[PDB]
């Protein structure tokens, strides 16, 4: 339940079983047990892989405690949803999403020479409608420059490429000046913070647009799934769902000795308890210990 | 919420807003005279200034007890609020039972009466399957895994295309 | 019996967290 690197990730989380294992470990430490030494080993690849597989154990049970704001009109449900995903990323050891995906860009193209190669390497992280708009600008300046546009910063091909990529990004709706002013910085705080307040209006626009796109896809998927399901007769629905339940339950009763399967069956028993305790008192809810 | 909060007996509500419960505070500089009045039973006390500041010393920290999860219950509530939208248009279906009598049987063409009885059987199919609300849970369990795999992103749980394109705008238009 | 707890009920159920933990426990020693 605790492996002494799991419990360091679970300190800053507010999830239920994570705080339960944290409280059990802290309670065992209060009865005179000793803190294990933190391993000063497992070099950068193993460290980043273990970070990836330790933050996911904070992320994914914390995703299931975030209610999707489906069918909710307005700004506040989508802002609540994106704020809860932000706080979940902060609890899991992520940075800001801007800083984290810019770190992904800097890690991917630490080795590139030409700008079409940074477009071939950050292909997976930018939208293809933006990648195509940058590729056509790159071919446009490549026709006139008669050289591969290198990733330099001061070459005339790069300057006349960036002066057009700023134009296409202004066309997309991304204010490139305020984003560059925030991520570059300024001296006087009363003129750096007046553009940080514009970067944060763009940033709030950006993450509510992304969370609303996720909510719209889940709405469309649930409506498509229901309207495929409402066309069946009831006996087909009952036998299909009973077969799916029985197969997924046999998959967990097949593998024994694993921790996930016995947690799966404990959770099935907990759903049966929830049904039983609602059955014994339906106008008050499930029986919570108080 | 935070560890130190700074509210209580200052710019507080002086009266209730609806007539379902009556509440008045006769606040002096030091303490307050509150009489809460709700129907049959009404209560009254003198709440200190050092009590409304001492109330947020411990936190309640409310949390939802769900059958499976809160995400699953949000998806199931959406499925239920869509099945209500389909039920509302199975609610405006015309009563075919007012045309079952034998004066409607023998006046009608045989194939049109067979089509009419098939339409009645079809409505019973649609109404029997739109009110199978014990299927919505296993329908919501089909939206959960793909969404929850999209939130196990290697970048961030909250990352999307707009923030990643804006960060590529910052990254590409900086000095390499 | 009934009336289980409060922290035992706040936990989301069919999240993975133990397939991720199983993949960590079968992967991180195998890559060390």
């Amino acid at each position: 339940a605790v492996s002494k690197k799991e419990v360091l990730y679970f300190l800053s989380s507010k999830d239920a079983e994570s705080s339960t294992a944290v409280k059990s470990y802290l309670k065992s430490l209060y009865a005179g047990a000793q803190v294990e030494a933190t391993e000063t080993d497992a070099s950068e690849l193993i460290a980043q892989l273990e970070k990836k597989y330790l933050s996911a154990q904070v992320v994914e049970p914390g995703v299931h405690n975030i209610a999707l704001p489906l069918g909710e009109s307005g700004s506040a449900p989508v802002k609540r949803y994106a704020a809860e995903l932000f706080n979940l990323g902060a609890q899991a050891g992520f940075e800001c999403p801007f800083i984290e995906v810019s770190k992904k860009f800097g890690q991917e193209t630490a080795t590139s020479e030409t700008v079409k190669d940074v477009l071939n390497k950050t292909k997976s992280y930018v939208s293809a409608d933006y990648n195509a708009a940058l590729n056509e600008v790159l071919s446009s300046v490549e026709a006139e420059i008669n050289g591969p546009v290198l990733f330099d910063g001061k070459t005339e091909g790069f300057k006349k490429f960036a002066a057009k990529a700023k134009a296409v990004a202004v066309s997309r709706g991304l204010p490139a000046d305020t984003i560059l002013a925030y991520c570059a910085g300024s001296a006087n705080e009363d003129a750096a913070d007046k553009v940080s307040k514009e970067f944060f209006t763009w940033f709030e626009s950006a993450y509510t647009a992304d969370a609303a796109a996720e909510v719209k896809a889940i709405e469309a998927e649930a409506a498509s799934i229901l309207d495929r399901h409402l066309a069946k007769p009831v006996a087909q629905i009952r036998k299909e769902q009973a077969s799916a339940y029985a197969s997924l339950l046999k998959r967990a009763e097949t593998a024994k000795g694993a921790k996930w399967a016995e947690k799966y069956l404990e959770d099935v028993k907990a759903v049966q308890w929830f049904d039983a305790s609602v059955a014994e008192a339906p106008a008050s809810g499930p029986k919570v210990a108080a | 919420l935070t560890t130190f909060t700074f509210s209580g007996l200052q710019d507080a509500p002086v009266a209730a807003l609806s007539g379902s419960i009556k509440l008045n505070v006769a606040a002096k500089a030091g303490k307050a005279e509150v009489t809460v009045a709700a129907g049959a039973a009404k209560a009254a006390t003198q709440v200190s200034a050092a009590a409304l500041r001492k109330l947020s010393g411990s936190k309640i920290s409310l949390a939802e007890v769900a059958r499976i999860s809160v995400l699953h219950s949000s998806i199931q509530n959406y499925l239920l609020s869509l099945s209500n939208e389909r039920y509302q248009l199975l609610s405006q279906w015309p009563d075919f039972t007012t045309m079952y009598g034998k004066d409607f049987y023998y006046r009608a063409h045989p194939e049109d009466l067979k089509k009419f009885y098939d339409a009645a059987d079809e409505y019973y199919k649609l109404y029997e399957t739109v009110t199978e609300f014990d299927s919505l849970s296993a329908l919501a369990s089909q939206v959960v895994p793909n969404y929850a795999a999209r939130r196990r992103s290697t970048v961030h749980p909250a990352i999307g295309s707009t923030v990643a394109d804006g960060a590529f705008t910052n990254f590409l238009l900086s000095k390499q | 019996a009934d009336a289980k707890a409060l922290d035992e009920l706040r936990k989301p159920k069919f999240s993975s967290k133990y397939l991720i933990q199983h993949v960590s426990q079968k992967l991180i020693p195998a890559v060390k």
């Binding site: 997976s124 469309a220 498509s224 | 059958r67 199975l90 990352i159 | 069919f14």
Partner: peptide
């Protein structure tokens, strides 16, 4: 009510693939 447990990551950043509108409301009005 239970779902298949998956342990895999999303290495790309993609728009979330909105699904097409079904004709079930139009077919039930028909």
């Amino acid at each position: 009510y239970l779902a298949p447990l998956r342990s895999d990551f999303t290495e790309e950043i993609t728009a979330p693939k909105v699904a097409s509108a079904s004709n079930l409301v139009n077919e039930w009005n028909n």
